[PDB]
């Protein structure tokens, strides 16, 4: 029962109607990342080969940051006027860096078992899926802290430099994500076929991870200021670009790898 | 918690002028500001009515592609770009913020009487 106005039944909705056709996917995502969960944790129950029961925390872990990618969608929408000025800041930031970590984290279990290697433990795949976003929670927590508390609120930054910062703050992941495709693109040396087509499954995925990266982050940058699209498509571009990369994640790559290892 | 409005160009039709309105001692991120023109006779008439953070721009029916708004609140300032100026639309254009929930404009201004006419 949250709409989109002004307020208390003021004038609804205006350029475009980005609220419940944005809502409803987060709703539906919300539902069927619980019931693929559910069904991943169930998962554990019937496998009995451990070469891949290595990469099951891992992929625990892409369906939690997705999980929280939608729950973020879902408060990204309301614009930065609430309390929710914070979350839009550091949660976007954590769940992004969780998530391409989480396929970093893959990637290298990949490298070391195409190549005649072992996989690495629970420990170790959940360590580096861990580790490289240790450095962008400690980014963001330090971001938003020093804002709300030493310096000016977020509330009262101009939008020339209220989305300029999610740049400045976002090119840690960015460079996870470039990191994750320079490693499944080099996979391509690889004698073993078992593991490949997940490494292809990574390919994909990184490269439309990476399309829809450079375009909405340099429309933000470039485009709105010339298209006049600011800032009425500021926040709904970003909550667009959230949901549909939340919606790739769960489709694009998860419904694929539980098709490589299915349910018997 | 008072409102002060800026421009004294004298700019002939079909040129382009710039609107403020500069206010101070309230929350800026708190309500909803209103553009509203002064006209003899009926009075008071809508124009554009920026809300939030700069997230809706609601042009005037009757201005709507001429006049261009924004809330900036780091300054809290509110201006309005009366470009491709029209020779009958000399009105005063009076700043508001408004209560929300009723749609009442407790705080407002003092407008500025722009006089573009051929």
């Known amino acids: 029962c949250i709409e989109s106005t002004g307020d208390y039944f003021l004038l609804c909705d205006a350029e475009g109607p980005w609220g419940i056709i944005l809502e409803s996917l987060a709703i539906l995502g919300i539902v069927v990342t619980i019931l693929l969960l559910l069904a991943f944790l169930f998962l554990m129950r019937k496998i009995q080969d451990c070469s891949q029961w290595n990469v099951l925390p891992t992929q625990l872990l892409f369906l939690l940051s997705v999980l929280g990618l939608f729950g973020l969608a879902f408060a990204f929408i309301i614009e930065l006027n609430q309390q929710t000025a914070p979350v839009r800041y550091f949660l976007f930031g954590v769940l992004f860096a969780l998530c391409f970590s989480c396929l970093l984290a893959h990637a290298s279990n990949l490298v070391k078992l195409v190549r005649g290697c072992v996989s690495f433990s629970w420990t170790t795949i959940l360590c580096i899926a861990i580790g490289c976003s240790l450095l962008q929670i400690i980014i963001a927590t330090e971001y938003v802290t020093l804002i709300m508390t030493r310096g000016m609120m977020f509330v009262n930054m101009t939008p020339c430099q209220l989305n300029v910062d999610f740049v400045v703050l976002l090119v840690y992941v960015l460079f996870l994500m470039a990191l994750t495709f320079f490693v499944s693109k080099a996979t391509f040396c690889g004698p073993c076929e078992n593991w490949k087509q997940h490494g292809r499954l990574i390919f994909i995925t990184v490269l439309f991870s990476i399309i829809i990266w450079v375009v909405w982050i340099s429309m933000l940058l470039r485009g709105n200021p010339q298209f006049q699209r600011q800032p009425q498509w500021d926040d709904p571009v970003v909550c667009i670009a959230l949901v549909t990369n939340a919606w790739v994640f769960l489709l694009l790559y998860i419904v694929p790898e539980l098709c490589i290892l299915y349910r018997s | 918690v008072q409102l002060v409005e800026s421009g004294g160009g004298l700019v002939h039709p079909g040129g382009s002028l710039r609107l403020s309105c500069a206010a101070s001692?309230?929350?800026?991120?708190?309500?909803?500001m209103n553009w509203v023109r002064q006209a003899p006779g009926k009075g008071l008439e809508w124009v554009s009515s920026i809300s939030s953070d700069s997230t809706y721009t609601y042009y005037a029916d009757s201005v709507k592609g001429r006049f261009t708004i924004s809330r900036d609140n780091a300054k809290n300032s509110l201006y309005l770009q009366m470009n491709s100026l029209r020779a009958e639309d000399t009105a005063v254009y009076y700043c508001?913020?408004?209560?929300?929930?009723?749609?009442?404009?407790?705080?407002w201004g003092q407008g500025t009487l722009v006089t573009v006419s051929s």
């Open positions: 508001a913020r408004s209560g929300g929930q009723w749609k009442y404009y407790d705080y």
């Open positions: 001692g309230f929350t800026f991120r708190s309500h909803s």
